[PDB]
Design an enzyme around this catalytic site. Structure first.
Site, PDB file in Angstrom:
ATOM      1  N   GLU A   1      -2.836  -1.793   8.896  1.00 52.25           N
ATOM      2  CA  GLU A   1      -1.952  -2.111  10.062  1.00 52.25           C
ATOM      3  C   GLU A   1      -0.857  -1.015  10.084  1.00 52.25           C
ATOM      4  O   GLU A   1      -0.416  -1.032  11.421  1.00 52.25           O
ATOM      5  CB  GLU A   1      -1.297  -3.496  10.033  1.00 52.25           C
ATOM      6  CG  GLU A   1      -2.209  -4.806  10.157  1.00 52.25           C
ATOM      7  CD  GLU A   1      -2.424  -4.983  11.415  1.00 52.25           C
ATOM      8  OE1 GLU A   1      -3.930  -5.213  11.705  1.00 52.25           O
ATOM      9  OE2 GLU A   1      -1.706  -4.844  12.435  1.00 52.25           O
TER      10      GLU A   1
ATOM     11  N   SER B   1      -0.991   7.689   6.101  1.00 53.43           N
ATOM     12  CA  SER B   1      -1.215   7.644   4.451  1.00 53.43           C
ATOM     13  C   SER B   1      -0.173   8.668   3.865  1.00 53.43           C
ATOM     14  O   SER B   1      -0.188   8.543   2.707  1.00 53.43           O
ATOM     15  CB  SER B   1      -2.381   8.167   4.215  1.00 53.43           C
ATOM     16  OG  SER B   1      -3.673   7.321   4.646  1.00 53.43           O
TER      17      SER B   1
HETATM   18  C1  LIG Z   1      -7.450   3.812  10.203  1.00 55.02           C
HETATM   19  C2  LIG Z   1      -7.337   5.172   9.488  1.00 55.02           C
HETATM   20  C3  LIG Z   1      -8.785   5.723   9.466  1.00 55.02           C
HETATM   21  S1  LIG Z   1      -9.493   6.006  11.164  1.00 55.02           S
HETATM   22  C4  LIG Z   1      -7.052   4.991   8.056  1.00 55.02           C
HETATM   23  O1  LIG Z   1      -7.210   4.120   7.378  1.00 55.02           O
HETATM   24  N1  LIG Z   1      -6.109   6.041   7.723  1.00 55.02           N
HETATM   25  C5  LIG Z   1      -5.825   6.094   6.170  1.00 55.02           C
HETATM   26  C6  LIG Z   1      -6.571   7.043   5.513  1.00 55.02           C
HETATM   27  C7  LIG Z   1      -7.756   7.705   6.356  1.00 55.02           C
HETATM   28  C8  LIG Z   1      -7.949   9.079   6.796  1.00 55.02           C
HETATM   29  C9  LIG Z   1      -8.993   9.584   7.443  1.00 55.02           C
HETATM   30  C10 LIG Z   1     -10.044   8.729   7.550  1.00 55.02           C
HETATM   31  C11 LIG Z   1     -10.033   7.548   7.002  1.00 55.02           C
HETATM   32  C12 LIG Z   1      -9.119   6.974   6.349  1.00 55.02           C
HETATM   33  B1  LIG Z   1      -3.999   6.645   6.329  1.00 55.02           B
HETATM   34  O2  LIG Z   1      -3.207   5.627   6.633  1.00 55.02           O
HETATM   35  O3  LIG Z   1      -3.940   7.727   7.069  1.00 55.02           O
END
Ligand SMILES: C[C@H](CS)C(=O)N[C@@H](Cc1ccccc1)B(O)O
Length: 264
Positions: free
Chosen positions: A143, A45
């Site tokens: 993705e 992210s």
């Molecule tokens: C798949 C994964 C979560 S397990 C995800 O969507 N990451 C994004 C943001 C995030 C980070 C921590 C927990 C949930 C969401 B990001 O792109 O880092």
């Protein structure tokens, strides 16, 4: 980039089990700290900080872009979209989407902004336009989180992340009001308290943007830090690991950030 006192980082990396990537610069002195600073790591992210900056850049050309309301649908709400979900019934302005993407790592908000900018290719082009030749975004959320070892999609390097961050928060890539807004959004981040912020003395102002892929021990943070009476420090700490089931560690990120700040 090099580092002739790298053993503290090497030992932390051995204890972690994966790979650690660090780049820090004191913008007052020019001193830097480096460890795998030129090696590619998944953005996860952390691309969302740069997405918000690209939106701010565009707002310099289209008046009223930031206040434009988006009335998005339920099927925009991919997992981990806490702000987008709370505000589904009202919609959100571009500015609110940008803030939620930065400060809550909101996935739906990120995808809606990417679309406004021409997708991953559009953000990658913006980053090319400020002189970043390493950054590439290739996929959308979720993705882009696959973090497969050796896959260059959706990656950058700690050094290129730090350099681009410095340009956008402290240099001239953004006009002054845009620049202040980007800094303000970073300072208001809520997801970063166990990462770089945990290594920073509590009297230093900090803005940051985290990333957490959820696989392959892959997580990261970048920040601008304002030491007392000094020009700011800009730094980036990225991790990955070789097995899909490997856990990321917030404590490793914090520890690598502290080794960097202490080296400076
Ligand atoms: C798949 C994964 C979560 S397990 C995800 O969507 N990451 C994004 C943001 C995030 C980070 C921590 C927990 C949930 C969401 B990001 O792109 O880092």
């Amino acid at each position: 980039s090099t580092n002739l006192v790298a053993e503290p980082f090497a030992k932390l990396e051995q204890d972690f089990g994966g790979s650690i990537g660090v780049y820090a610069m004191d913008t007052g002195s020019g001193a830097t700290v480096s460890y795998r600073a030129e090696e590619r790591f998944p953005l996860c992210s952390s691309f969302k900080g740069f997405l918000a900056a690209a939106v701010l850049a565009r707002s310099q050309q289209q008046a009223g872009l930031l206040d434009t309301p988006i009335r998005y649908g339920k099927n925009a709400l991919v997992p981990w979209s806490p702000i987008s979900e709370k505000y589904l019934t009202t919609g959100m302005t571009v500015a609110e989407l940008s803030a939620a993407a930065v400060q809550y790592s909101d996935n739906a908000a990120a995808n809606l902004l990417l679309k406004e900018l021409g997708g991953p290719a559009g953000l990658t082009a913006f980053m090319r336009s400020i002189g970043d030749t390493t950054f590439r975004l290739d996929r959308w959320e979720l993705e882009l989180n696959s973090a497969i070892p050796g896959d260059a999609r959706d990656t950058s390097s700690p050094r290129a992340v730090t350099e681009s961050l410095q340009k956008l928060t402290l240099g001239s890539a953004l006009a002054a009001p845009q620049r202040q807004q980007f800094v303000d959004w970073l300072k208001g981040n809520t997801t970063g308290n166990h990462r770089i912020r945990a290594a920073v003395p509590a009297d230093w102002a900090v803005g940051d943007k985290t990333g957490t892929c959820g696989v392959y021990g892959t997580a990261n943070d970048y920040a601008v830090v304002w030491p007392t009476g000094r020009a700011p420090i800009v730094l980036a700490v990225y991790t990955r690991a070789p097995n899909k089931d490997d856990k990321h560690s917030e404590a490793v990120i914090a520890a690598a950030a502290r080794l960097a700040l202490e080296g400076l």
